[PDB]
């Protein structure tokens, strides 16, 4: 349409604005819907349509409200129970993190890549102090998938001179979408269109120590000895799947036995979300390689980190350029990360995550037994929780109904029936009660709805006998579950 | 030793400081050397030793000086002829980019991942306006290697239902170090320790249209039909290798003929460095997929972009989650990118890059004819230039001698004899002449140096006349050529 | 007796014989010899020629070049490449590029005259 200069200028004018009048708002929303349709992806528009009602599919981000709230272009405020799928552990625009990023921005945002940058050393030292056991050396990148790529490359550089090439992952796992990481990721629909991927990747059931022992033993028998095992301590996109107690310990023991490396993917569970700094600290398990991202950026910067023992990381000492990345370890990202570690440790946000997590999960379990017609079960650990519903449509209506009540929730990439609850660790108790009540009203509306459909498909009743039921349902919506009871109580007698 | 909290607190105290006293500086440099040794990589310390003399290996970054200068922890100012290997096209802490990043930081740094974020739409529209031909849809990530990963995955999703799986790259190419991108990258030492990589990747000589035609025709004959060809318009890491005029056009025609996709990797050559916004505009060639990073962040943010035609990008419309990335398209990075596009277009920095590039390359070629004993050839296009020396030791001494004169230069990952000159496009004419003069003094010192060694190693010489010879060598450097001859004149006469 | 006879009958240092039952099996044994010799030396990729035929067992089929013979059974062995038959510069290019990228060639396999290609004669030398 217009020249690139005009577009950029308009964009900067809109970046400098702090509030919008409604004709400004309507024009901007119309613009972003158009440019999403013609330059980003129209599929996204259809998806949000499936998780909203009416023009709610077209809510546009504008600004962080408070630590735990987001404000769209219309001034509507939302409680964030999504947390960017584990990004905003210390809330939105955390004053400490914003302050550090602002100071380093005043000093120097990106490094020369040639001279020694001090914040990379400081952050590496901090992470060595913060990680269990012999985890000592850190490599910095910009995303979770990049961290997993660095983990895989470390394992390969260490194990290939030892005649081991095959990797074991678990079904339902997610480790990123770059081709290397995608070889470990387990969701069929994510992988099939891009096959062939890396050779020698195998998957076993998550939480099943005997299956994994079988895989390692068979790989040894056939000469395809396993270089590394990679897993999440708790599967995020699988629907917040908790392994049996002692699973991580048994996996460590197994890797020690077969001489395979243990790669723990804590991209989602890390930085205090599960009640401790890292999920592996629940069992005092130290992997050979640990993957971090998301929350490590403090909800301000993109960052990833791959920490390893000196024994394995030493494969990069002779040639320090064997693995690099363009922006990795830039001063802005490092400042963000250091500020985030400081905030988490000074406010003991892991413990808070355990308390608030217990409270929210208590509420969700009570709602789960009150609504077994819609909720299958609620699960979680710390502030990483999920509610699995009976259908996908049901969980869809839940996401929509929560969005209408201005509480942000979203689904899970590998589980279509599950809705995740992943709010900031700074979520207040008041907002905890508010989100529990919001969930209650959501489930109530959904029960009314499923009753309303089920009454329409019952075969053994006349054309006007339903209309009395629909009528009574709508203007007197109180006889609800018990009403549905009445409906079938006539349908089965008329059968 | 110390807790993570103490380390973080110290790091933030140091982020808030703007200058360092002498003893604070000595303690910080000692700290950063230690933590690099024990937590980052000791190999880096050895590398910087190989490109410096004495404590120069231990210069620590601190702050951007001006648009084109960097200041270490000791207050020493360096002219940046490295530009972060193509990152700082608009200089360091560009006021426009810093301003946009600060405004968006005041609103919201990272997006929810659920709602529509407006700056992603704005940037996608801007890039559609700025890119040649039918390049229309953009996917945003955080690095060059991620952009190449998205390019490969687009090609795979498009070509796998058409029975095409193999990829053609070129020798000397660099496309990233994530395993997917690493399958395309061509440098042996980067790839061997991590094999096996993706199957079906082949390489042909860069700039050789008949070799590539041979590869495609043989792949068709054997049923391994090529899905895509990926190449840089000018190989940056290969030593700034220029293809014959018309090569890119012929590659486009060839891909059109065989029904393969053309992936142009402009991670390094993009954003005005080669005298035009994209290098592909020199021949008016539109690829199917275009890769951007580095300079697109304005030297403030990490960002990557993969732009494609609707025909190819439409493979993600039915399932918009088929390829995603955690931080991709965050508001901070988008603000940076829009600011950079604005700066480049408003100050016509591409044309400036052509002018200053021509001037610097003229100077380097003159120095090349004056010093054929050290310089093999100088080459470049716009402000992407390189000087290839006779050996690696020579180019090493050049990098060191330029570092001592406080001009920043570095080598190229795929070429050990070549030193790249990649300064900001905002480099001023005064600094251009200063860099030419610095190169002259460097080459002079290197010639006097090689003379000094050759005089030092002659075996048919006692100690007295050797002391006289190097004494004279110091006291009259312009006689360097003659005395060395004299030295051998005598080293032969007593053999 | 047959191994000794073949040693007497073959040019130069060809000395040891392995006996199988078919051409494709002979090519399989050739490939396995090359692999066992070159894998401890860090070389894995094989170069064949277009129009070549070396058998239809999967190993040999990786070297065989006819599209219709191979496509329905892909994926085959990794690291097999083809260059035009009789073109020494193309093959030199393949070997040099394989060395540059760290995919060093373990072996080159070819017929002295391509039978199924239509009795294709290479240039003298």
Coordinates of C-alpha atoms in Angstrom, one line a residue, chain A residues 18-495:
Chain A
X18 CA 0.3 6.1 25.8
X19 CA -3.5 6.1 25.5
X20 CA -5.9 5.9 22.6
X21 CA -9.2 7.5 22.0
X22 CA -11.9 5.1 20.8
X23 CA -11.6 6.1 17.1
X24 CA -7.9 5.7 17.5
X25 CA -8.6 2.3 19.1
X26 CA -11.1 1.2 16.5
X27 CA -8.7 2.2 13.7
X28 CA -5.8 0.4 15.3
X29 CA -7.8 -2.8 16.0
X30 CA -9.0 -2.8 12.4
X31 CA -5.5 -2.3 11.2
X32 CA -4.0 -5.1 13.3
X33 CA -6.7 -7.5 12.3
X34 CA -6.1 -6.6 8.6
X35 CA -2.3 -7.0 8.9
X36 CA -2.6 -10.2 10.8
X37 CA -4.9 -11.5 8.0
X38 CA -2.6 -10.5 5.2
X39 CA 1.0 -10.5 6.7
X40 CA 1.2 -12.6 9.8
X41 CA -1.3 -15.6 9.8
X42 CA -5.1 -15.6 9.3
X43 CA -5.2 -19.0 11.1
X44 CA -4.4 -17.2 14.4
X45 CA -7.6 -15.2 13.9
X46 CA -9.6 -18.4 13.4
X47 CA -8.0 -20.0 16.5
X48 CA -8.9 -17.1 18.8
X49 CA -12.4 -17.2 17.3
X50 CA -12.6 -20.8 18.5
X51 CA -11.6 -19.7 22.1
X52 CA -13.8 -16.5 22.4
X53 CA -17.3 -15.2 21.9
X54 CA -18.0 -12.3 19.5
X55 CA -15.5 -9.5 19.0
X56 CA -13.5 -10.9 22.0
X57 CA -11.5 -12.7 19.3
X58 CA -10.1 -9.3 18.4
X59 CA -8.6 -8.1 21.7
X60 CA -5.3 -6.3 21.0
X61 CA -2.5 -6.0 23.5
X62 CA -1.6 -2.6 24.6
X63 CA 0.1 -2.3 28.0
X64 CA 0.9 -4.1 31.2
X65 CA -1.6 -3.0 33.9
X66 CA 0.0 -4.1 37.1
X67 CA 2.3 -7.0 38.0
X68 CA -0.5 -9.5 37.3
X69 CA -2.8 -7.6 34.8
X70 CA -2.8 -6.8 31.1
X71 CA -4.7 -4.0 29.4
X72 CA -5.9 -4.2 25.9
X73 CA -6.5 -1.3 23.4
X74 CA -10.0 -0.7 24.9
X75 CA -8.8 -0.3 28.5
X76 CA -10.2 -3.7 29.5
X77 CA -8.0 -5.2 32.3
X78 CA -7.3 -9.0 32.5
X79 CA -5.8 -11.0 35.3
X80 CA -3.0 -13.0 33.7
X81 CA -3.4 -16.7 34.5
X82 CA -1.4 -17.6 31.4
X83 CA 1.9 -16.0 32.3
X84 CA 3.2 -16.3 28.7
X85 CA 3.3 -20.1 29.3
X86 CA 5.8 -19.6 32.0
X87 CA 7.5 -16.3 31.1
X88 CA 6.1 -13.8 33.6
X89 CA 7.2 -15.5 36.9
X90 CA 8.0 -12.2 38.5
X91 CA 5.0 -10.4 36.9
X92 CA 4.7 -7.8 34.1
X93 CA 7.2 -4.9 34.1
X94 CA 8.8 -5.9 37.3
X95 CA 10.4 -2.7 38.7
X96 CA 13.7 -4.3 39.5
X97 CA 14.1 -6.0 36.1
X98 CA 12.9 -2.9 34.2
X99 CA 15.4 -0.9 36.2
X100 CA 18.3 -3.1 35.5
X101 CA 17.4 -3.3 31.8
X102 CA 17.1 0.5 31.7
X103 CA 20.5 1.1 33.3
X104 CA 22.3 -1.4 31.0
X105 CA 20.4 0.1 28.0
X106 CA 21.8 3.5 29.1
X107 CA 25.3 1.8 29.1
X108 CA 25.3 -0.7 26.2
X109 CA 22.5 -3.0 24.9
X110 CA 24.5 -5.5 22.7
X111 CA 28.1 -6.6 23.0
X112 CA 30.8 -6.5 20.3
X113 CA 31.1 -10.3 20.4
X114 CA 34.9 -9.9 20.5
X115 CA 35.8 -8.3 23.8
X116 CA 34.9 -9.8 27.2
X117 CA 31.5 -8.6 28.3
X118 CA 31.2 -8.6 32.1
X119 CA 27.5 -9.4 32.6
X120 CA 28.0 -12.7 30.8
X121 CA 30.7 -13.7 33.4
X122 CA 28.6 -12.4 36.3
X123 CA 25.5 -14.3 35.1
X124 CA 27.5 -17.5 34.5
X125 CA 28.9 -17.3 38.1
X126 CA 25.5 -16.6 39.5
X127 CA 24.0 -19.6 37.7
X128 CA 26.8 -21.8 38.9
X129 CA 26.0 -20.7 42.5
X130 CA 22.3 -21.3 41.9
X131 CA 22.3 -24.7 40.2
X132 CA 22.6 -28.1 41.9
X133 CA 25.9 -29.9 42.3
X134 CA 28.6 -29.8 39.6
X135 CA 26.6 -27.7 37.1
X136 CA 29.3 -25.1 36.4
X137 CA 29.5 -23.7 32.9
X138 CA 26.8 -21.8 31.0
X139 CA 26.1 -21.1 27.4
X140 CA 23.7 -18.2 26.7
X141 CA 21.3 -18.0 23.7
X142 CA 17.9 -16.4 23.1
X143 CA 15.2 -19.0 23.4
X144 CA 14.2 -22.4 24.9
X145 CA 14.6 -24.2 21.6
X146 CA 18.1 -22.8 21.3
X147 CA 18.9 -24.0 24.8
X148 CA 17.8 -27.5 23.9
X149 CA 19.9 -27.3 20.7
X150 CA 23.0 -26.4 22.7
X151 CA 22.2 -29.3 25.1
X152 CA 21.9 -31.7 22.2
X153 CA 25.2 -30.4 20.6
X154 CA 27.0 -30.7 23.9
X155 CA 25.8 -34.3 24.3
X156 CA 26.8 -35.1 20.7
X157 CA 30.3 -33.5 21.0
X158 CA 30.8 -35.5 24.2
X159 CA 29.4 -38.9 23.2
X160 CA 30.3 -39.2 19.5
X161 CA 34.0 -39.8 20.3
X162 CA 32.7 -42.5 22.7
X163 CA 30.6 -44.3 20.0
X164 CA 27.2 -43.2 21.2
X165 CA 24.7 -41.4 18.9
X166 CA 21.1 -42.2 19.8
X167 CA 18.8 -40.0 21.9
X168 CA 15.9 -41.1 24.1
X169 CA 13.1 -38.7 24.8
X170 CA 9.5 -39.2 26.1
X171 CA 6.1 -39.2 24.5
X172 CA 4.1 -36.0 25.3
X173 CA 7.4 -34.1 25.6
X174 CA 8.0 -30.7 24.2
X175 CA 11.6 -29.3 23.8
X176 CA 11.2 -26.8 21.0
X177 CA 10.5 -26.5 17.3
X178 CA 13.9 -25.9 15.7
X179 CA 14.7 -29.1 13.8
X180 CA 17.3 -30.4 16.3
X181 CA 15.0 -29.8 19.3
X182 CA 12.0 -30.9 17.2
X183 CA 13.7 -34.3 16.9
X184 CA 13.2 -34.6 20.7
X185 CA 9.8 -33.0 20.8
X186 CA 7.1 -35.7 20.6
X187 CA 3.9 -34.4 19.2
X188 CA 3.1 -36.1 15.8
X189 CA 1.5 -33.0 14.2
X190 CA 4.5 -30.9 15.1
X191 CA 6.9 -33.4 13.5
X192 CA 5.4 -35.3 10.5
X193 CA 5.4 -32.4 7.9
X194 CA 9.2 -31.8 8.5
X195 CA 10.4 -35.4 8.5
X196 CA 13.1 -36.6 8.0
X197 CA 14.5 -35.1 11.2
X198 CA 17.7 -36.1 13.1
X199 CA 18.4 -39.9 13.0
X200 CA 18.5 -42.0 16.1
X201 CA 15.8 -40.3 18.3
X202 CA 13.5 -42.7 20.3
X203 CA 10.7 -42.1 22.7
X204 CA 9.4 -44.0 25.7
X205 CA 6.4 -43.4 27.9
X206 CA 6.9 -40.6 30.4
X207 CA 7.2 -41.6 34.0
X208 CA 7.8 -45.3 33.2
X209 CA 11.3 -46.2 34.4
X210 CA 11.1 -49.8 33.2
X211 CA 10.2 -48.7 29.6
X212 CA 13.3 -46.4 29.6
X213 CA 15.5 -49.1 31.0
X214 CA 14.3 -51.4 28.3
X215 CA 15.1 -48.8 25.6
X216 CA 18.6 -48.3 27.0
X217 CA 19.3 -52.0 27.3
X218 CA 18.0 -52.8 23.8
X219 CA 20.0 -49.9 22.4
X220 CA 23.1 -51.3 24.0
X221 CA 22.4 -54.9 22.8
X222 CA 22.1 -53.6 19.1
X223 CA 25.1 -51.3 19.2
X224 CA 23.0 -48.1 19.1
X225 CA 24.2 -47.0 22.6
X226 CA 22.4 -44.0 23.9
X227 CA 24.3 -40.7 24.1
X228 CA 21.7 -38.8 26.3
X229 CA 18.3 -38.9 27.8
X230 CA 16.3 -35.7 27.7
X231 CA 13.1 -35.0 29.6
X232 CA 11.1 -32.4 31.4
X233 CA 10.8 -32.9 35.2
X234 CA 7.1 -32.2 34.7
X235 CA 5.6 -32.2 31.2
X236 CA 4.1 -28.7 30.6
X237 CA 2.4 -29.1 27.2
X238 CA 1.4 -32.7 28.0
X239 CA -1.2 -31.3 30.4
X240 CA 1.1 -30.8 33.4
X241 CA 2.0 -34.5 33.8
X242 CA 3.5 -35.4 37.1
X243 CA 5.9 -38.4 37.2
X244 CA 5.7 -40.9 40.0
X245 CA 7.8 -40.0 43.1
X246 CA 11.4 -41.0 42.6
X247 CA 11.2 -41.1 38.8
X248 CA 13.8 -38.4 38.3
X249 CA 16.1 -40.1 40.8
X250 CA 15.7 -43.5 39.0
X251 CA 16.4 -41.8 35.6
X252 CA 19.6 -40.3 37.0
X253 CA 20.7 -43.7 38.4
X254 CA 19.9 -45.3 35.0
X255 CA 21.9 -42.7 33.1
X256 CA 24.8 -43.2 35.5
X257 CA 24.5 -47.0 35.0
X258 CA 24.5 -47.0 31.2
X259 CA 26.9 -44.0 30.8
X260 CA 24.4 -41.8 29.2
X261 CA 24.0 -38.1 29.8
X262 CA 20.9 -36.7 31.6
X263 CA 19.5 -33.6 30.0
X264 CA 16.8 -31.8 32.1
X265 CA 14.6 -29.5 30.1
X266 CA 13.5 -26.9 32.7
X267 CA 12.5 -24.2 30.2
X268 CA 9.0 -24.2 31.6
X269 CA 9.4 -25.5 35.2
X270 CA 12.5 -23.5 36.0
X271 CA 12.8 -20.2 37.9
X272 CA 10.7 -21.0 40.9
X273 CA 7.4 -22.0 39.2
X274 CA 7.1 -25.5 40.8
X275 CA 7.7 -24.2 44.4
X276 CA 11.5 -24.5 44.2
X277 CA 14.1 -22.7 42.0
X278 CA 14.2 -25.8 39.7
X279 CA 11.9 -28.8 39.6
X280 CA 14.9 -31.1 39.9
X281 CA 15.4 -29.8 43.4
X282 CA 12.3 -31.6 44.6
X283 CA 14.3 -34.9 44.5
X284 CA 17.8 -33.4 44.7
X285 CA 18.7 -34.6 41.2
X286 CA 21.6 -33.0 39.4
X287 CA 21.5 -33.6 35.6
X288 CA 24.6 -33.4 33.4
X289 CA 22.9 -30.6 31.3
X290 CA 20.2 -28.2 32.4
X291 CA 18.1 -26.1 30.0
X292 CA 16.6 -22.7 31.0
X293 CA 14.6 -20.0 29.3
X294 CA 11.3 -18.1 29.5
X295 CA 11.2 -16.9 33.0
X296 CA 14.9 -16.4 33.1
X297 CA 14.3 -13.2 31.1
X298 CA 12.1 -11.7 33.9
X299 CA 9.3 -11.1 31.5
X300 CA 11.3 -8.3 29.9
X301 CA 14.0 -9.9 27.7
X302 CA 14.4 -13.0 25.6
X303 CA 17.1 -15.3 26.9
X304 CA 18.1 -19.0 27.1
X305 CA 20.8 -20.8 29.1
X306 CA 22.4 -24.2 28.9
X307 CA 24.3 -25.1 32.0
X308 CA 26.6 -28.2 32.2
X309 CA 29.2 -29.9 34.3
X310 CA 32.8 -29.1 33.4
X311 CA 33.2 -32.8 32.4
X312 CA 30.8 -32.4 29.5
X313 CA 31.2 -28.6 28.8
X314 CA 34.9 -29.0 28.3
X315 CA 34.2 -30.3 24.8
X316 CA 34.2 -26.6 23.8
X317 CA 37.4 -25.5 25.5
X318 CA 39.8 -26.3 22.6
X319 CA 37.6 -24.4 20.1
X320 CA 35.4 -21.8 21.7
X321 CA 33.7 -21.1 18.4
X322 CA 32.5 -24.7 18.0
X323 CA 29.0 -23.5 19.1
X324 CA 28.0 -19.9 19.1
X325 CA 24.9 -17.8 18.6
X326 CA 24.5 -14.3 17.2
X327 CA 22.9 -12.4 20.2
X328 CA 23.6 -14.9 23.0
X329 CA 24.5 -13.4 26.4
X330 CA 23.9 -9.8 25.4
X331 CA 24.1 -7.3 28.3
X332 CA 20.4 -6.5 28.2
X333 CA 19.4 -10.2 28.6
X334 CA 22.0 -10.7 31.3
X335 CA 20.8 -7.7 33.2
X336 CA 17.3 -9.0 33.0
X337 CA 18.3 -12.5 34.2
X338 CA 20.4 -11.2 37.1
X339 CA 17.6 -8.9 38.2
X340 CA 15.2 -11.9 38.0
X341 CA 17.4 -14.2 40.1
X342 CA 17.7 -11.3 42.7
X343 CA 13.9 -10.8 42.8
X344 CA 13.2 -14.5 43.2
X345 CA 15.7 -14.9 46.0
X346 CA 14.9 -11.7 47.9
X347 CA 11.2 -12.2 47.9
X348 CA 11.4 -16.0 48.2
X349 CA 9.0 -16.3 45.3
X350 CA 9.4 -20.1 45.1
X351 CA 7.9 -20.6 48.5
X352 CA 5.1 -18.2 47.7
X353 CA 4.5 -20.2 44.5
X354 CA 4.1 -23.3 46.7
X355 CA 1.5 -21.6 49.0
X356 CA -0.5 -19.8 46.3
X357 CA -0.3 -23.0 44.2
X358 CA -1.7 -25.1 47.0
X359 CA -4.5 -22.6 47.4
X360 CA -5.4 -22.4 43.7
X361 CA -5.2 -26.2 43.3
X362 CA -7.4 -26.7 46.3
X363 CA -10.0 -24.4 44.7
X364 CA -9.7 -26.2 41.4
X365 CA -10.1 -29.6 42.9
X366 CA -13.2 -28.6 44.8
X367 CA -14.7 -27.2 41.6
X368 CA -13.6 -30.5 40.0
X369 CA -15.7 -32.6 42.3
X370 CA -18.6 -30.1 42.1
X371 CA -18.5 -30.3 38.3
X372 CA -17.7 -33.9 37.3
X373 CA -19.9 -33.5 34.2
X374 CA -17.3 -31.0 32.8
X375 CA -14.0 -31.4 34.7
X376 CA -12.1 -34.7 34.5
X377 CA -9.4 -33.7 37.0
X378 CA -7.2 -30.8 38.1
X379 CA -3.5 -31.2 38.7
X380 CA -0.5 -29.1 39.4
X381 CA 2.7 -28.4 41.3
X382 CA 3.5 -25.0 42.7
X383 CA 2.1 -22.4 40.2
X384 CA 2.2 -24.8 37.2
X385 CA -1.4 -26.2 37.1
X386 CA -3.9 -27.5 34.6
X387 CA -7.5 -28.5 34.4
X388 CA -8.4 -31.4 32.0
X389 CA -11.9 -31.4 30.8
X390 CA -14.2 -34.1 29.3
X391 CA -14.0 -32.8 25.8
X392 CA -12.0 -30.3 23.8
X393 CA -15.1 -28.2 23.1
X394 CA -15.7 -28.1 26.9
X395 CA -12.2 -26.7 27.7
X396 CA -12.7 -24.4 24.7
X397 CA -15.9 -23.0 26.3
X398 CA -14.0 -22.7 29.6
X399 CA -11.2 -20.6 28.0
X400 CA -13.9 -18.4 26.3
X401 CA -15.9 -18.0 29.5
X402 CA -12.8 -17.1 31.5
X403 CA -11.8 -14.6 28.8
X404 CA -15.2 -13.0 29.0
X405 CA -14.7 -12.5 32.8
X406 CA -11.3 -10.9 32.0
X407 CA -9.2 -13.8 33.3
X408 CA -6.5 -15.0 30.8
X409 CA -6.1 -18.7 30.3
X410 CA -5.0 -20.8 27.3
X411 CA -4.7 -24.4 26.1
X412 CA -1.6 -26.7 26.0
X413 CA 0.2 -27.5 22.7
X414 CA 0.2 -31.3 23.2
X415 CA -3.1 -31.6 25.0
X416 CA -6.4 -30.4 23.5
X417 CA -8.6 -31.2 26.5
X418 CA -6.4 -29.4 29.0
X419 CA -6.3 -25.7 30.0
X420 CA -3.2 -24.5 31.8
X421 CA -3.2 -22.2 34.8
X422 CA 0.2 -20.5 34.9
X423 CA -0.2 -17.1 36.6
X424 CA 2.8 -15.0 37.8
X425 CA 4.3 -16.1 41.1
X426 CA 3.5 -12.5 42.3
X427 CA -0.3 -13.1 42.0
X428 CA -2.0 -11.8 45.1
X429 CA -4.4 -13.7 47.3
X430 CA -7.2 -11.4 46.4
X431 CA -6.6 -12.3 42.7
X432 CA -6.4 -16.0 43.7
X433 CA -9.9 -15.8 45.1
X434 CA -11.1 -13.8 42.1
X435 CA -9.8 -16.4 39.7
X436 CA -11.4 -19.2 41.7
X437 CA -14.8 -17.4 41.6
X438 CA -14.3 -16.7 37.8
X439 CA -13.7 -20.5 37.3
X440 CA -16.9 -21.2 39.3
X441 CA -19.0 -18.9 37.1
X442 CA -17.4 -20.3 34.0
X443 CA -18.3 -23.9 35.0
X444 CA -21.8 -22.8 35.9
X445 CA -22.4 -21.2 32.5
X446 CA -20.9 -24.3 30.8
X447 CA -23.2 -26.6 32.7
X448 CA -26.2 -24.5 31.7
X449 CA -25.0 -24.8 28.1
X450 CA -24.3 -28.6 27.9
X451 CA -27.7 -29.1 29.6
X452 CA -29.2 -26.9 26.9
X453 CA -27.8 -29.0 24.1
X454 CA -28.5 -32.4 25.7
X455 CA -32.1 -31.4 26.1
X456 CA -32.3 -30.7 22.3
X457 CA -31.0 -34.1 21.2
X458 CA -33.2 -36.4 23.4
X459 CA -35.3 -38.4 20.9
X460 CA -38.3 -39.7 22.9
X461 CA -40.3 -36.5 23.5
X462 CA -42.6 -34.4 21.3
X463 CA -41.8 -31.2 19.5
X464 CA -43.5 -29.0 22.1
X465 CA -42.4 -30.9 25.2
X466 CA -38.8 -29.6 24.7
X467 CA -39.9 -26.0 24.3
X468 CA -41.3 -26.0 27.8
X469 CA -37.9 -27.3 29.0
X470 CA -35.9 -24.7 27.0
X471 CA -38.2 -21.9 28.2
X472 CA -38.0 -22.9 31.8
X473 CA -34.2 -23.2 31.4
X474 CA -33.9 -19.7 30.0
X475 CA -36.2 -17.4 32.0
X476 CA -35.9 -19.5 35.2
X477 CA -32.2 -20.8 34.9
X478 CA -32.1 -22.5 38.4
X479 CA -33.6 -25.9 37.7
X480 CA -30.4 -26.7 35.8
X481 CA -28.6 -30.0 36.5
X482 CA -31.8 -31.2 38.2
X483 CA -33.7 -29.9 35.1
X484 CA -31.6 -32.0 32.8
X485 CA -32.5 -34.8 35.1
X486 CA -36.2 -34.1 34.5
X487 CA -35.6 -34.1 30.7
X488 CA -34.0 -37.6 30.7
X489 CA -36.5 -38.7 33.4
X490 CA -39.2 -38.2 30.8
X491 CA -37.1 -39.4 27.8
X492 CA -36.3 -42.8 29.4
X493 CA -39.9 -43.4 30.5
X494 CA -41.0 -42.5 26.9
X495 CA -38.3 -44.8 25.5

